[PDB]
Design a binder for this molecule. Structure first.
Ligand code: 24Y
Length: 127
């Protein structure tokens, strides 16, 4: 069983930009979520081999995690805030799709998502 290559975190062909909103996503949003008690399952790509979930990448064709998000923000990979928001929403959705409602990981994701939403409710207007 093999993992797919992880999502890219830089690309010379993709335009890059810093915006005040992306900075807020790194400094406030990601910072807050990263150190939460439930962040650890989401801090890196799902290692389907070592975790023994060999159907994970049969079901999840759009893998995303906060390690990837963090590196993309750090690298200025994103053009806008909406690209970054999308990656968080992809991560959460992947968890809900693969796992069964109720399950512990799902409750962890929900708590993380609640906090995410609270933080992006205060995204600044772009300068
Ligand atoms: C929470 C869980 C339950 C059952 C199987 N694997 C997991 N793990 N374990 C980890 C882990 C372990 C050590 C260091 C970093 C992450 N990550 C998961 C995991 C399982 N299923 C998922 O949908 C995600 Cl997003 C993470």
């Amino acid at each position: 069983s093999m993992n797919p290559p992880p999502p890219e975190t830089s690309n010379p062909n993709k335009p890059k930009r810093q915006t005040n909103q992306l900075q807020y996503l790194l400094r406030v949003v990601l910072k807050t979520l990263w150190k939460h008690q439930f962040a650890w399952p989401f801090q890196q790509p799902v290692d389907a081999v070592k975790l023994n979930l060999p159907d994970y990448y049969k079901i999840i064709k759009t893998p995303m995690d906060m390690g990837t998000i963090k590196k993309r923000l750090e690298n200025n990979y994103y053009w806008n805030a909406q690209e970054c928001i999308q990656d968080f929403n992809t991560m959460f959705t992947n968890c809900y799709i693969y796992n069964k409602p109720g399950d512990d990981i799902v409750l962890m994701a929900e708590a993380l998502e609640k906090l995410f939403l609270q933080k992006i409710n205060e995204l600044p207007t772009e300068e």
